[PDB]
Design a protein around this nucleic acid. Structure first.
Ligand SMILES: [Zn+2]
Lengths: 81, 150, 126
RNA sequence: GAUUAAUAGGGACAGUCGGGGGCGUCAGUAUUCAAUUGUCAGAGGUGAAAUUCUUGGAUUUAUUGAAGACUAACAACUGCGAAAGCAUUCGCCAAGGAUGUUUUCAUUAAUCAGGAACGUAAACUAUUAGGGAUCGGACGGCGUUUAUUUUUGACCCGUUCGGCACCUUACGAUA
RNA sequence: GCUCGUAGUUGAACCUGGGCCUAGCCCGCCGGUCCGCCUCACCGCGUGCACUGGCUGGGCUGGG
């Protein structure tokens, strides 16, 4: 307070700032890869999906939508990129 | 600030930096374009197209992958809605409210909201008229809104 | 809404110079704001600024300036008018500067009298 | 041949949120009226009285029935609606807010001349800079209780947007 | 009383090809000295980590 480096905020204070209020704004959502153990299929799901994402066939599920992050279903794997 | 009703509301969708790569989210731009074209042929709005892409395919933004936005792409391949999506949805909403009023009239709150929607439509309509989108003279009353419906 | 983003920036600078802070976050950036702060930095009333991108400007200020202002109708001014405009805008002729959007760019009134060019009065600081 | 994608817009989708609105429906007592009994001398009001009802039985006691009204306690330094205002359950009908999104056209916007929709009272009076509460999302988690174990919810904590209000400070003001 | 709304008013940011000269170096070409080659000789060729000068030959960088 009184003087601070405004071009170099700390990553920890930057990380607790709201989305639109970081120095250059940017998202905080991510993409996941999801397989369901009987299938060798790799569907890529967005973290905050509004669609009941289905794998390439097999009338299953992969996630359900919410007010925030998509709740991935049951036993499923996820790497995140 | 959110136009009609009081209340700020900062609910906004963020756009990241570097308008080019997301590399590990593969697939050529041509394939994405053909998928968008297929969706347009099935009869879906640009916003619905974007939502579908978000759901299933390895995309971030069309404007990132391809040189153009969705609406712009649709216009290049001549597969665009008659009344630019948002305007169409507003007129559908206005029709629904008018039909509700016809069913039951005394509801004054519904009549007020109808008036609000009509004002918002006129606000959109003037600016669409200015940017050479819609032909000059565009009525938005029950004589023409009902005919439009879909 | 104030479309004068230069006036929003200069309002933020005046609020920081009153509150005794040592930097700001000028949230809507421009190019006329960058030229304005370039003149203020030439005359030493602002330490060091950077334009970061989402963009915004981080302006390290020394604690030396008193007031920033924009002239909102942006009146045109010749040199023989410029002397009277300087002595009617500033508290003293040796304190503070008047900003001019000339045909040679954006500069202070002493640089305008050096380069023999007139123009519109856009702002002032002291 | 088509920029930043705006820390201004409008729309779409998802989980939602609300004593917001309309129509129906369901209850709850209480009051009045009437009936059936047990009555058996006053009852009602008022500071005192009086008008009135009262052996064909008033007021009272019990049980039913009808009608109209309203929704106690929960009920708040809260919630929703632009305002007046809005509190029984359930169903239907559209609408709205905020959040999240891996959603779109890219100035569409801001302000109000003219005009348009909703409608017995008064009486003491660019930030402040954060903190403690509060509710609506969204995310995260050492854990207690659901949980016969996963969901999921309740409680505690942190981050983040958004909003009614408190106190401090004014950053000042000024009539 | 509140909201919508027209004339009117304020209206976001983003937006200086060719040739000539010049200095430094490199790569290459060319003339001469020295040395070597070959030609009977005349002569020519190689010849600047042996020497020296030229090239409006080619390349990179700086300045006008
Ligand atoms: Zn599968």
């Amino acid at each position: 307070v009184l003087a601070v480096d405004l071009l170099n905020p700390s990553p920890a204070s930057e990380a607790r700032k709201h989305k639109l209020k970081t120095l250059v704004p940017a998202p905080r959502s991510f993409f996941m890869d999801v397989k369901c153990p009987g299938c060798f299929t790799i569907t890529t799901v967005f973290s905050h999906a509004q669609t009941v994402v289905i794998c390439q066939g097999c009338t299953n599920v992969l996630c359900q939508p919410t007010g925030g992050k998509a709740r991935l279903t049951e036993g499923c794997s996820f790497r995140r990129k | 600030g959110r136009l009609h009703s009081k209340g700020k509301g900062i609910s906004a969708s963020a756009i990241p930096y570097s308008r080019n790569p997301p590399a590990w989210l593969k697939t050529t731009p041509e394939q994405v374009v053909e998928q968008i074209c297929k969706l347009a042929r099935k009869g879906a709005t640009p916003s619905q197209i974007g939502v579908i892409l978000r759901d299933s395919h390895g995309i971030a933004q069309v404007k990132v992958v391809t040189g153009n936005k969705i609406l712009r792409i649709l216009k290049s391949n001549g597969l665009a809605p008659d009344i630019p999506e948002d305007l169409y949805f507003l007129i559908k909403k206005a029709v629904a409210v008018r039909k509700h009023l016809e069913r039951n009239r005394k509801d004054k709150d519904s009549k007020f909201r109808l008036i609000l929607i009509e004002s918002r439509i006129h606000r959109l309509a003037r600016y669409y008229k200015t940017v050479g989108v819609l032909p000059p003279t565009w009525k938005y009353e029950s004589s023409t809104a009902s005919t439009l419906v879909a | 809404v104030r479309t004068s983003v230069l006036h929003d920036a200069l309002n933020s600078i005046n609020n920081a110079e009153k509150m005794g802070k040592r930097q700001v976050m000028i949230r809507p950036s421009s190019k006329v704001i960058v030229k304005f702060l370039q003149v203020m930095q030439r005359h030493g009333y602002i330490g060091e600024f950077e334009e970061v991108d989402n963009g915004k400007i981080v302006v390290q200020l020394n604690g030396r300036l008193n007031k920033c202002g924009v002239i909102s109708p942006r009146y045109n001014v010749r040199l023989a008018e410029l002397e009277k405009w300087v002595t009617k805008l500033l508290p003293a002729r040796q304190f503070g500067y008047v900003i001019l959007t000339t045909s040679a760019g954006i500069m202070d009134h002493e640089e305008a009298r050096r380069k023999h060019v007139a123009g519109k009065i856009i702002g002032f600081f002291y």
